[PDB]
Amino acid sequence: MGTFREEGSVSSGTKQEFHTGKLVTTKGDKELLIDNEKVTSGHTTTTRRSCSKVITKTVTNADGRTETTKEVVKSEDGSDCGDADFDWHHTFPSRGNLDDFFHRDKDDFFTRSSHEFDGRTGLAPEFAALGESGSSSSKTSTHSKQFVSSSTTVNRGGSAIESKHF
Secondary structure: OOOOOOOOOOOOOOOOOOOOOOOOOOOOOOOOOOOOOOOOOOOOOOOEEOOOEEEOOEEOOOOOOOEEOOEEEOOOOOOOOOOOOOOOOOOOOOOOOOOOOOOOOOOOOOOOOOOOOOOOOOOOOOOOOOOOOOOOOOOOOOOOOOOOOOOOOOOOOOOOOOOOOO
C-alpha cells in the first residue's frame, strides 16, 4: 500500500514517542550553570577549620625551599568549642575545721601558758639587823660587875658608937 519510503526501518527508537524533537544531542547546556552550592553549605575547611583555631600553610619549591607551617592552635577563647574550662584550679572536697587558725572567734580567759617568771616575792629567813624582837633585852650575858652594889654599910649602926681605945 504506497511505497512511500519503506525499505527496512526508516525510523528510530522501538517507537517514536513524539516524532523527532532534537537536533544535536551532544551539546545542549543552556542553564546547567545554576548555582550548585546554592544558598546553603559553603565555607572554607582545608585552609582553616572553624570552631577551634587551626592554621596550616605549606609551600614546596624546586630548590628545596619548603616552609611547613602545619601548626594547630587550641581554641581562641572558648567561644563555642573549648567550653567547660575557664581556668584550672580544682577544689578540695571539705577539710576538717578544729579551732580558728588565727581569727580566734570566741576568745577565752585562759591565755597562752607562757612559762615566764612573774615571781618576785622572796621572804628572808630573818632580818639580820635590828633584831629588837625577843623581849627588849640583850645586855644580859657575861653579867660583869657593871651593876653597882656596895652602898649599905652606911646604913643604921650595927649597935652603937663606942671608942674603946683612945
